[PDB]
Amino acid sequence: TSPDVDLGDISGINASVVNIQKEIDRLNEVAKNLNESLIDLQ
Amino acid sequence: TSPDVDLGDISGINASVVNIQKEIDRLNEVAKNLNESLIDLQ
Amino acid sequence: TSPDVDLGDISGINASVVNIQKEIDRLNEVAKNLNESLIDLQ
Amino acid sequence: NVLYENQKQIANQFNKAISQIQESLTTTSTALGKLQDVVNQNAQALNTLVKQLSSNFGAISSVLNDILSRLDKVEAE
Amino acid sequence: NVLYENQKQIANQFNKAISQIQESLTTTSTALGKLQDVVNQNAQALNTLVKQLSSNFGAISSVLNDILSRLDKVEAE
Amino acid sequence: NVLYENQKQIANQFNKAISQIQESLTTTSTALGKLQDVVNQNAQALNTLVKQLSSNFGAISSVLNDILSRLDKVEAE
């Protein structure tokens, strides 16, 4: 009377996603804002 | 008359590679170029 | 006389972990150290 | 003239250097975006893979158990 | 007054710009930390997956071979 | 002397700060390189995994179907 095979359940293994959009966008903004940190020496 | 097993074909699942070498290299260059943005006040 | 199934051994496939903690920490430090690169014009 | 051009020295450098820094920031932003995109694609790939694998192991399990039961009976008679 | 305020021009900009740069550095650091965390979690997931898969293929292999041997014998008699 | 040293104040800071910024850029570059390397290694691992899995499921499928057909015939006679 053969025992059940009993394979392991892998369905709980999950890969996560990253969200750094806030940071990416902010870097572009800080770059644009360094325009009005430029000097006009007159 | 047993039906075919019909497993799902997983061979179309692909992981992508990233190429940011241009950016990595450019950061090192901009760092080296900030040498001649240094002041000699005389 | 049926030949052995002979599945491929996948147990040598390994994903690597990254360690950039030194760099992450150093960026925060350099940010804090740009306080005493600020001018007091008197 | 001398110390009036000393204030014109500071300005040419600080301007040019900010141009380099602005470029470094957008380059960093681009690099981070490219990493986010691949990291997330590969996450998706892995999750899809787990789905399909979990399906396939269900089927395999079920069929193996059925075969074992069938073969047991055929051997017992 | 004129060229004394020319040294007060340089200072207001350089101060404000360092404030922007300091922010850019901590933002970059935060982004890198978030990528390190996900990259490593997904590495772990993959390694766990390989463990479990290697276990399951061992079992499947063994059972298939047993079935094949059993069926061979039953067909040969 | 007073406002001539006011132009020597600006220079000591801007120089030292550029030294910090240059360091921040090479540190960022190093961090991005380390992430690119691991991301790509783990991509490779995943793709290798899919290859081997697709091979193994082919074999498993084929063997299961053969067993089922064989057992059908043995039960029908």
Tab-separated table of C-alpha atoms in Angstrom:
chain	number	residue	atom	x	y	z
A	1	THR	CA	0.000	0.000	0.000
A	2	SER	CA	2.037	2.859	-1.373
A	3	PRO	CA	2.270	6.077	0.698
A	4	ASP	CA	1.242	9.358	-0.859
A	5	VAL	CA	4.031	11.136	-2.704
A	6	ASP	CA	3.780	14.315	-0.522
A	7	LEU	CA	5.633	16.948	-2.505
A	8	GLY	CA	6.550	20.196	-0.891
A	9	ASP	CA	4.234	23.223	-1.442
A	10	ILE	CA	6.260	25.989	-3.043
A	11	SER	CA	3.350	28.419	-3.538
A	12	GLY	CA	4.357	30.621	-0.647
A	13	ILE	CA	7.658	31.606	-2.273
A	14	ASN	CA	7.261	35.194	-3.465
A	15	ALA	CA	9.494	37.781	-5.010
A	16	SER	CA	9.018	41.376	-3.952
A	17	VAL	CA	8.892	44.460	-6.144
A	18	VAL	CA	10.817	47.627	-5.463
A	19	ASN	CA	9.389	51.166	-5.499
A	20	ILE	CA	12.008	53.921	-5.717
A	21	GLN	CA	10.046	56.170	-8.110
A	22	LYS	CA	9.831	58.958	-5.484
A	23	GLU	CA	13.632	58.972	-5.242
A	24	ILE	CA	14.268	58.781	-8.997
A	25	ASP	CA	11.894	61.685	-9.630
A	26	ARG	CA	13.332	63.740	-6.793
A	27	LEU	CA	16.856	63.436	-8.201
A	28	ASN	CA	15.697	64.903	-11.497
A	29	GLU	CA	13.988	67.753	-9.606
A	30	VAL	CA	17.010	68.625	-7.449
A	31	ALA	CA	19.037	68.723	-10.712
A	32	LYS	CA	16.586	71.229	-12.232
A	33	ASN	CA	16.555	73.288	-9.016
A	34	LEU	CA	20.319	73.755	-9.141
A	35	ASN	CA	19.632	76.194	-12.014
A	36	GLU	CA	18.577	78.917	-9.568
A	37	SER	CA	21.573	78.095	-7.387
A	38	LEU	CA	23.743	79.427	-10.240
A	39	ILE	CA	25.354	82.859	-9.858
A	40	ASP	CA	24.895	85.933	-12.006
A	41	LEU	CA	27.928	88.024	-11.018
A	42	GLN	CA	26.739	91.248	-12.748
B	1	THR	CA	-8.120	5.639	-21.621
B	2	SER	CA	-6.060	8.090	-19.631
B	3	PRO	CA	-5.795	11.694	-20.912
B	4	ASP	CA	-2.386	13.187	-21.543
B	5	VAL	CA	-0.844	14.858	-18.514
B	6	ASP	CA	-0.532	18.291	-20.261
B	7	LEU	CA	1.909	20.209	-18.103
B	8	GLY	CA	2.318	23.897	-18.576
B	9	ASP	CA	5.232	25.141	-20.766
B	10	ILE	CA	7.411	27.409	-18.663
B	11	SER	CA	10.120	27.969	-21.303
B	12	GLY	CA	8.934	31.445	-22.157
B	13	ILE	CA	9.687	32.787	-18.672
B	14	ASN	CA	12.804	34.940	-18.981
B	15	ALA	CA	14.772	37.174	-16.698
B	16	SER	CA	16.238	40.333	-18.160
B	17	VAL	CA	19.721	41.735	-17.677
B	18	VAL	CA	20.463	45.328	-16.819
B	19	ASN	CA	23.012	47.566	-18.567
B	20	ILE	CA	23.965	50.693	-16.617
B	21	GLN	CA	27.687	50.613	-17.496
B	22	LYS	CA	27.426	53.952	-19.366
B	23	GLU	CA	26.059	55.574	-16.203
B	24	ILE	CA	28.552	53.951	-13.817
B	25	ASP	CA	31.472	55.037	-15.999
B	26	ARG	CA	30.105	58.541	-16.433
B	27	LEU	CA	29.870	59.044	-12.666
B	28	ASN	CA	33.556	58.243	-12.300
B	29	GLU	CA	34.351	60.706	-15.116
B	30	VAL	CA	32.300	63.582	-13.677
B	31	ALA	CA	34.157	62.964	-10.370
B	32	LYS	CA	37.532	63.295	-12.131
B	33	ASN	CA	36.346	66.397	-14.016
B	34	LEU	CA	35.528	68.196	-10.778
B	35	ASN	CA	39.319	68.551	-10.353
B	36	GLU	CA	39.420	71.424	-12.852
B	37	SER	CA	36.367	72.951	-11.193
B	38	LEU	CA	38.596	73.561	-8.146
B	39	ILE	CA	39.815	77.105	-7.456
B	40	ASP	CA	43.364	78.386	-7.279
B	41	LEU	CA	42.897	81.701	-5.452
B	42	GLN	CA	46.452	83.006	-6.130
C	1	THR	CA	13.885	-2.987	-19.065
C	2	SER	CA	13.187	0.690	-18.615
C	3	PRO	CA	16.171	3.077	-18.311
C	4	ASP	CA	16.446	5.322	-15.289
C	5	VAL	CA	14.677	8.650	-15.668
C	6	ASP	CA	17.895	10.705	-15.074
C	7	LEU	CA	16.639	14.186	-14.295
C	8	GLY	CA	19.025	17.067	-14.269
C	9	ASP	CA	20.473	18.203	-10.885
C	10	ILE	CA	19.545	21.834	-10.358
C	11	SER	CA	20.992	22.138	-6.833
C	12	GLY	CA	24.040	24.046	-7.968
C	13	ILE	CA	21.987	27.009	-9.199
C	14	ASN	CA	22.499	29.813	-6.684
C	15	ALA	CA	21.483	33.414	-6.420
C	16	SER	CA	23.965	35.838	-4.926
C	17	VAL	CA	23.329	38.551	-2.362
C	18	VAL	CA	24.561	42.098	-2.676
C	19	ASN	CA	26.376	44.085	0.030
C	20	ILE	CA	26.452	47.845	-0.558
C	21	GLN	CA	25.890	48.847	3.092
C	22	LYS	CA	29.325	50.545	3.265
C	23	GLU	CA	28.344	52.747	0.316
C	24	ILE	CA	24.827	53.533	1.563
C	25	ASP	CA	26.174	54.550	4.972
C	26	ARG	CA	28.981	56.602	3.474
C	27	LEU	CA	26.537	58.637	1.380
C	28	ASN	CA	24.634	59.621	4.507
C	29	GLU	CA	27.930	60.605	6.179
C	30	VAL	CA	29.185	62.745	3.282
C	31	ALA	CA	25.769	64.503	3.385
C	32	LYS	CA	26.217	65.290	7.097
C	33	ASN	CA	29.816	66.428	6.515
C	34	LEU	CA	28.708	69.023	3.978
C	35	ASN	CA	27.406	70.996	6.993
C	36	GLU	CA	30.925	72.178	7.852
C	37	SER	CA	31.540	72.950	4.187
C	38	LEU	CA	28.921	75.712	4.551
C	39	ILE	CA	30.098	79.331	4.737
C	40	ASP	CA	29.601	81.833	7.524
C	41	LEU	CA	30.325	85.126	5.742
C	42	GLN	CA	30.478	87.257	8.941
D	1	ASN	CA	40.570	94.521	-10.951
D	2	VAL	CA	42.743	92.075	-8.979
D	3	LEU	CA	40.408	91.266	-6.064
D	4	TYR	CA	37.414	92.107	-8.293
D	5	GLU	CA	38.580	89.335	-10.640
D	6	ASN	CA	39.063	87.148	-7.531
D	7	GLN	CA	35.256	87.154	-7.224
D	8	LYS	CA	35.056	86.290	-10.969
D	9	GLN	CA	37.304	83.264	-10.380
D	10	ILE	CA	34.953	81.706	-7.834
D	11	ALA	CA	31.954	82.196	-10.160
D	12	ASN	CA	33.348	80.480	-13.282
D	13	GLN	CA	34.217	77.340	-11.272
D	14	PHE	CA	31.066	77.065	-9.144
D	15	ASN	CA	28.959	77.482	-12.301
D	16	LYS	CA	30.851	74.822	-14.280
D	17	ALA	CA	30.874	72.410	-11.323
D	18	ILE	CA	27.127	72.737	-10.758
D	19	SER	CA	26.773	71.771	-14.429
D	20	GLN	CA	28.752	68.594	-13.679
D	21	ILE	CA	26.726	67.889	-10.548
D	22	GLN	CA	23.407	68.356	-12.324
D	23	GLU	CA	24.567	65.830	-14.898
D	24	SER	CA	25.666	63.394	-12.202
D	25	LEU	CA	22.205	63.558	-10.597
D	26	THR	CA	20.291	62.795	-13.778
D	27	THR	CA	22.749	60.009	-14.620
D	28	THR	CA	22.230	58.495	-11.146
D	29	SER	CA	18.441	58.819	-11.600
D	30	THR	CA	18.605	57.058	-14.968
D	31	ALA	CA	20.738	54.234	-13.535
D	32	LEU	CA	18.307	53.743	-10.633
D	33	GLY	CA	15.348	53.629	-13.043
D	34	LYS	CA	17.025	50.985	-15.200
D	35	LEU	CA	17.729	48.845	-12.036
D	36	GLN	CA	14.153	49.268	-10.765
D	37	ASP	CA	12.758	48.131	-14.115
D	38	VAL	CA	14.924	44.963	-14.314
D	39	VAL	CA	14.536	44.109	-10.626
D	40	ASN	CA	10.777	44.263	-11.025
D	41	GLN	CA	10.662	42.392	-14.291
D	42	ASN	CA	12.727	39.606	-12.795
D	43	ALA	CA	10.446	39.562	-9.712
D	44	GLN	CA	7.523	39.129	-12.005
D	45	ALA	CA	9.288	36.355	-13.860
D	46	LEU	CA	10.004	34.541	-10.643
D	47	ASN	CA	6.426	34.876	-9.420
D	48	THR	CA	5.061	33.614	-12.749
D	49	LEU	CA	7.490	30.726	-12.548
D	50	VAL	CA	6.265	29.801	-9.048
D	51	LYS	CA	2.659	29.853	-10.250
D	52	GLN	CA	3.323	27.555	-13.107
D	53	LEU	CA	5.507	25.251	-11.054
D	54	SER	CA	2.910	24.987	-8.318
D	55	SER	CA	0.374	24.023	-10.963
D	56	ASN	CA	2.651	21.432	-12.433
D	57	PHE	CA	3.528	19.829	-9.110
D	58	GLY	CA	-0.126	19.547	-8.292
D	59	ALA	CA	-0.772	17.647	-11.438
D	60	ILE	CA	2.358	15.470	-11.052
D	61	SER	CA	1.467	14.644	-7.454
D	62	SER	CA	-2.046	13.680	-8.363
D	63	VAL	CA	-1.010	11.490	-11.299
D	64	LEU	CA	1.755	9.755	-9.303
D	65	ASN	CA	-0.609	8.948	-6.507
D	66	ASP	CA	-3.169	7.563	-8.931
D	67	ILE	CA	-0.543	5.429	-10.687
D	68	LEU	CA	0.730	4.085	-7.330
D	69	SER	CA	-2.772	3.179	-6.227
D	70	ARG	CA	-3.524	1.500	-9.537
D	71	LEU	CA	-0.282	-0.426	-9.589
D	72	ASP	CA	-0.862	-1.531	-5.896
D	73	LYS	CA	-4.219	-2.993	-6.854
D	74	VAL	CA	-2.893	-4.701	-9.976
D	75	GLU	CA	-0.059	-6.286	-7.968
D	76	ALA	CA	-2.439	-7.340	-5.134
D	77	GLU	CA	-4.688	-9.254	-7.548
E	1	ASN	CA	28.972	97.696	-0.753
E	2	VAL	CA	29.025	96.725	-4.448
E	3	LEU	CA	31.957	94.274	-4.479
E	4	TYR	CA	31.306	93.525	-0.783
E	5	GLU	CA	27.819	92.354	-1.794
E	6	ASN	CA	29.489	90.428	-4.656
E	7	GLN	CA	30.954	88.156	-1.957
E	8	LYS	CA	27.443	87.914	-0.400
E	9	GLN	CA	26.049	86.733	-3.750
E	10	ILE	CA	28.372	83.731	-3.935
E	11	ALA	CA	27.501	82.715	-0.350
E	12	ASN	CA	23.690	82.635	-0.674
E	13	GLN	CA	23.912	80.341	-3.731
E	14	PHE	CA	26.633	77.956	-2.528
E	15	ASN	CA	24.734	77.529	0.757
E	16	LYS	CA	21.381	76.817	-0.923
E	17	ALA	CA	22.975	74.465	-3.470
E	18	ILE	CA	24.770	72.445	-0.793
E	19	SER	CA	21.331	72.020	0.796
E	20	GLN	CA	20.103	70.538	-2.500
E	21	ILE	CA	23.164	68.318	-2.818
E	22	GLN	CA	22.860	67.013	0.731
E	23	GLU	CA	19.275	66.068	-0.055
E	24	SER	CA	20.296	64.367	-3.290
E	25	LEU	CA	22.835	62.227	-1.404
E	26	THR	CA	20.389	60.978	1.208
E	27	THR	CA	17.790	60.326	-1.499
E	28	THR	CA	20.355	58.293	-3.479
E	29	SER	CA	21.283	56.400	-0.282
E	30	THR	CA	17.629	55.601	0.410
E	31	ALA	CA	17.080	54.386	-3.168
E	32	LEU	CA	20.157	52.134	-2.975
E	33	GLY	CA	18.962	50.673	0.343
E	34	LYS	CA	15.529	49.874	-1.082
E	35	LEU	CA	17.194	48.106	-4.113
E	36	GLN	CA	19.583	46.157	-1.860
E	37	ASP	CA	16.681	44.938	0.273
E	38	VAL	CA	14.578	43.715	-2.701
E	39	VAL	CA	17.547	42.252	-4.579
E	40	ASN	CA	18.446	40.232	-1.509
E	41	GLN	CA	14.924	39.167	-0.708
E	42	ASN	CA	14.466	37.933	-4.248
E	43	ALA	CA	17.828	36.098	-4.050
E	44	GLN	CA	16.597	34.385	-0.960
E	45	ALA	CA	13.346	33.489	-2.657
E	46	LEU	CA	15.181	31.981	-5.573
E	47	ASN	CA	17.496	29.966	-3.336
E	48	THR	CA	14.553	28.663	-1.291
E	49	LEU	CA	12.822	27.756	-4.526
E	50	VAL	CA	15.865	25.775	-5.722
E	51	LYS	CA	15.982	23.885	-2.426
E	52	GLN	CA	12.399	22.874	-2.599
E	53	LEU	CA	12.576	22.010	-6.276
E	54	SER	CA	15.651	19.866	-5.775
E	55	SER	CA	13.784	18.011	-3.049
E	56	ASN	CA	10.776	17.504	-5.229
E	57	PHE	CA	12.736	16.241	-8.220
E	58	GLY	CA	14.481	13.751	-6.014
E	59	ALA	CA	11.219	12.333	-4.887
E	60	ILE	CA	9.708	12.376	-8.409
E	61	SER	CA	12.769	10.655	-9.855
E	62	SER	CA	12.708	7.966	-7.236
E	63	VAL	CA	8.983	7.270	-7.599
E	64	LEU	CA	9.152	7.209	-11.421
E	65	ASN	CA	11.991	4.761	-11.373
E	66	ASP	CA	10.157	2.522	-8.928
E	67	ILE	CA	6.973	2.626	-11.022
E	68	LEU	CA	8.940	1.797	-14.206
E	69	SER	CA	10.637	-1.143	-12.537
E	70	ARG	CA	7.353	-2.422	-11.151
E	71	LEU	CA	5.528	-2.048	-14.430
E	72	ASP	CA	8.463	-3.824	-16.283
E	73	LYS	CA	8.115	-6.810	-13.984
E	74	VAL	CA	4.328	-6.924	-14.254
E	75	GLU	CA	4.545	-6.828	-18.064
E	76	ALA	CA	7.325	-9.489	-18.135
E	77	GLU	CA	5.193	-11.967	-16.170
F	1	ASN	CA	42.675	91.895	4.452
F	2	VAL	CA	39.086	91.709	5.747
F	3	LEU	CA	37.170	91.480	2.448
F	4	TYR	CA	40.270	89.946	0.810
F	5	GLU	CA	40.031	87.123	3.365
F	6	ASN	CA	36.275	86.997	2.613
F	7	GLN	CA	37.248	85.640	-0.822
F	8	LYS	CA	39.601	83.157	0.939
F	9	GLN	CA	36.681	81.904	3.052
F	10	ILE	CA	34.607	80.902	0.030
F	11	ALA	CA	37.574	79.043	-1.513
F	12	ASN	CA	38.462	76.795	1.454
F	13	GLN	CA	34.848	75.559	1.708
F	14	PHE	CA	34.089	75.073	-1.997
F	15	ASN	CA	37.353	73.126	-2.357
F	16	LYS	CA	36.678	70.847	0.630
F	17	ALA	CA	33.049	70.291	-0.412
F	18	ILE	CA	33.997	69.332	-3.968
F	19	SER	CA	36.284	66.740	-2.360
F	20	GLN	CA	33.240	65.336	-0.535
F	21	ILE	CA	31.126	65.410	-3.685
F	22	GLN	CA	33.770	63.658	-5.766
F	23	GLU	CA	33.847	60.924	-3.144
F	24	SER	CA	30.061	60.654	-3.127
F	25	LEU	CA	30.047	60.154	-6.913
F	26	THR	CA	32.578	57.333	-6.918
F	27	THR	CA	30.801	55.698	-3.971
F	28	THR	CA	27.483	55.881	-5.865
F	29	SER	CA	29.203	54.436	-8.966
F	30	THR	CA	30.636	51.554	-6.937
F	31	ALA	CA	27.240	50.804	-5.360
F	32	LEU	CA	25.549	50.784	-8.784
F	33	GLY	CA	28.213	48.421	-10.160
F	34	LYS	CA	27.748	45.988	-7.275
F	35	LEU	CA	23.910	46.012	-7.870
F	36	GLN	CA	24.334	45.521	-11.633
F	37	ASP	CA	26.607	42.529	-11.052
F	38	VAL	CA	24.219	40.770	-8.609
F	39	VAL	CA	21.086	41.628	-10.592
F	40	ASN	CA	22.656	40.084	-13.669
F	41	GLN	CA	24.036	37.051	-11.913
F	42	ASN	CA	20.637	36.333	-10.432
F	43	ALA	CA	19.026	36.812	-13.879
F	44	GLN	CA	21.404	34.262	-15.234
F	45	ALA	CA	20.609	31.899	-12.398
F	46	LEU	CA	16.918	32.213	-13.056
F	47	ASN	CA	17.327	31.628	-16.786
F	48	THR	CA	19.504	28.558	-16.171
F	49	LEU	CA	16.897	27.309	-13.736
F	50	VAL	CA	14.126	27.694	-16.340
F	51	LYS	CA	16.189	25.761	-18.882
F	52	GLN	CA	16.767	22.883	-16.586
F	53	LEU	CA	13.197	22.852	-15.343
F	54	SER	CA	11.816	22.872	-18.864
F	55	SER	CA	14.024	19.890	-19.634
F	56	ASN	CA	12.888	18.052	-16.569
F	57	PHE	CA	9.191	18.645	-17.172
F	58	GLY	CA	9.564	17.353	-20.679
F	59	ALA	CA	11.003	14.143	-19.435
F	60	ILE	CA	8.455	13.822	-16.591
F	61	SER	CA	5.565	14.462	-18.969
F	62	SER	CA	6.784	11.891	-21.419
F	63	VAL	CA	7.367	9.210	-18.780
F	64	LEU	CA	3.990	9.835	-17.093
F	65	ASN	CA	2.173	9.542	-20.360
F	66	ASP	CA	3.977	6.317	-21.194
F	67	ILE	CA	3.212	4.849	-17.759
F	68	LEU	CA	-0.483	5.820	-18.075
F	69	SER	CA	-0.736	4.223	-21.494
F	70	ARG	CA	0.989	1.071	-20.295
F	71	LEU	CA	-1.120	0.793	-17.182
F	72	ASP	CA	-4.344	1.378	-19.295
F	73	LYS	CA	-3.429	-1.550	-21.512
F	74	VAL	CA	-2.515	-3.819	-18.606
F	75	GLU	CA	-5.834	-3.042	-16.888
F	76	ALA	CA	-7.821	-3.521	-20.150
F	77	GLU	CA	-6.431	-7.039	-20.641
